[PDB]
Amino acid sequence: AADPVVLMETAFRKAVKSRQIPGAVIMARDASGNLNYTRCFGARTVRRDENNQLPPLQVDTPCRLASATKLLTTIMALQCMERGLVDLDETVDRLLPDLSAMPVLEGFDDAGNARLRERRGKITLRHLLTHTSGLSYVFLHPLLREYMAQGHLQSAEKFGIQSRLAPPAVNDPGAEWIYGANLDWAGKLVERATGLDLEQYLQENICAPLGITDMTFKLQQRPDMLARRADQTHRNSADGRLRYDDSVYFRADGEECFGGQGVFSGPGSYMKVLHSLLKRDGLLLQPQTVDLMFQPALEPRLEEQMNQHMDASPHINYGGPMPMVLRRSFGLGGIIALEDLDGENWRRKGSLTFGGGPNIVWQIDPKAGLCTLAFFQLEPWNDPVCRDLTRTFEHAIYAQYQQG
């Protein structure tokens, strides 16, 4: 290895030895196809097995991707566009007439009555994939917070509407960037345009081309990869020690396919998606279509307010290991760096990035010719030693690779 990489590798092993992280999978690939950096550290749980050992994280270990699923669903959405089933600026009301019928929540009275209102303008597939449709996640928006407390989402059952699709919009399309259930809608777009449930689409149109056999929504129907699945671990906010996280169990996710989250896979298979997109090999997506994913999709006003929002909310930190304050846009699939994160030393301008709940982070850097993947199974998102370790990971392999 190189000097910076052996120091980073030691930084990781000390975090496993000193109980800071349970484990991590770390992977980096070149566009030229001759960088194959993949290391594994520590365990896939904090729970000791029947053997009284910690079973190790490994490159094929099935892992909860959480919101890192959104990238996969962006590909499925764009795959449908390539095939002339949809168009980016086609109104969604053909394939999503239930979304298109939803109103926008304007606010409340002094009496406390909810003011619903007809949407101004039409929602498009491009809006969904850039989080500019105008819908938010309930627990983020103060209007949706109260709307939920009033109990108006309880009637979704009656009309057969799915819980995650139930909330009304908080704004019009093209007004704001707002993080929401857009890929859950995009997933529905894909299903009804193609006539297949997401899971069969994923298998046929993403796993098969790349030779993947450990990527699925239905983890319960795969006993072989369920037997060696990673566990979730949570970091205590009090003492900073890590404990077993059994929150998934009590939630009962339970065989329900949606495009925003839900997919389990090995880190190796997820890097295979990042790798294909980087080298323009056409197995998932037409190179011209990939070019679009890295194009700033946001209008100047929208990107200005998206930066304001992200810069003003460090407790969420969408741009994980990147500088807390940084000029970004959004392409189709993730956040785009509108500038070099640190001259030639780190991610270059035009690089695409998004992450996942258990501190999963991916990035693709066309201009630098690199793509990296930092894979953890540790909550909450925006964890400091995960963020820090990832930061030292990227810096190290960018350094080794590009000069000398």
UniProtKB/Swiss-Prot annotation:
InterPro entries per the UniProt record, alphabetical: Beta-lactam-related, Beta-lactam/transpept-like, Diverse_Enzym_Activities
Effect of residue 266 to S: Strongly increases simvastatin synthase activity upon overexpression in E.coli
Positions that bind 2-methylbutanoate: 357
Outcome of mutating residue 114 to P: Strongly increases simvastatin synthase activity upon overexpression in E.coli and abolishes activity with LovD-bound alpha-methylbutanoate
SUPFAM superfamilies attached to this UniProt entry: beta-lactamase/transpeptidase-like
GO molecular-function term, one example from the UniProt record: hydrolase activity
Result of changing residue 19 to S: Strongly increases simvastatin synthase activity upon overexpression in E.coli and abolishes activity with LovD-bound alpha-methylbutanoate
SS bonds (residue pairs): none
Mutation effect (residue 183 to I): Strongly increases simvastatin synthase activity upon overexpression in E.coli and abolishes activity with LovD-bound alpha-methylbutanoate
Reactions catalysed according to its record: monacolin J carboxylate + (S)-2-methylbutanoyl-[2-methylbutanoate polyketide synthase] = lovastatin carboxylate + holo-[2-methylbutanoate polyketide synthase]
Stated consequence of mutating residue 182 to G: Strongly increases simvastatin synthase activity upon overexpression in E.coli and abolishes activity with LovD-bound alpha-methylbutanoate
This enzyme's EC code(s): 2.3.1.238
GO terms of biological process kind: antibiotic biosynthetic process; defense response to fungus; lovastatin biosynthetic process; polyketide biosynthetic process
Record annotation: effect of changing residue 163 to N: Strongly increases simvastatin synthase activity upon overexpression in E.coli and abolishes activity with LovD-bound alpha-methylbutanoate
Biotech exploitation of the protein: Lovastatin acts as a hypolipidemic agent that works as inhibitor of (3S)-hydroxymethylglutaryl-coenzyme A (HMG-CoA) reductase (HMGR) which reduces HMG-CoA to mevalonate and is the key step in cholesterol biosynthesis. Lovastatin, simvastatin and related compounds are widely used to treat hypercholesteremia and reduce the risk of cardiovascular disease. Furthermore, statins such as lovastatin were found to be anticancer agents.
Effect of residue 67 to A/N: Abolishes enzyme activity
Keyword annotations: Acyltransferase, Hydrolase, Transferase
Effect of residue 100 to C: Strongly increases simvastatin synthase activity upon overexpression in E.coli and abolishes activity with LovD-bound alpha-methylbutanoate
Consequence of substituting residue 155 to G: Strongly increases simvastatin synthase activity upon overexpression in E.coli and abolishes activity with LovD-bound alpha-methylbutanoate
TM region(s), chain numbering: none
Mutation effect (residue 148 to V): Strongly increases simvastatin synthase activity upon overexpression in E.coli and abolishes activity with LovD-bound alpha-methylbutanoate
Cross-referenced PANTHER family: (LOVD), PUTATIVE (AFU_ORTHOLOGUE AFUA_5G00920)-RELATED (PTHR43283:SF17), BETA-LACTAMASE-RELATED (PTHR43283)
Function: Monacolin J acid methylbutanoyltransferase; part of the gene cluster that mediates the biosynthesis of lovastatin (also known as mevinolin, mevacor or monacolin K), a hypolipidemic inhibitor of (3S)-hydroxymethylglutaryl-coenzyme A (HMG-CoA) reductase (HMGR). The first step in the biosynthesis of lovastatin is the production of dihydromonacolin L acid by the lovastatin nonaketide synthase lovB and the trans-acting enoyl reductase lovC via condensation of one acetyl-CoA unit and 8 malonyl-CoA units. Dihydromonacolin L acid is released from lovB by the thioesterase lovG.
Similarity annotation: Belongs to the class-A beta-lactamase family.
Name of the protein in question: Monacolin J acid methylbutanoyltransferase
Encoding gene, per UniProt annotation: lovD
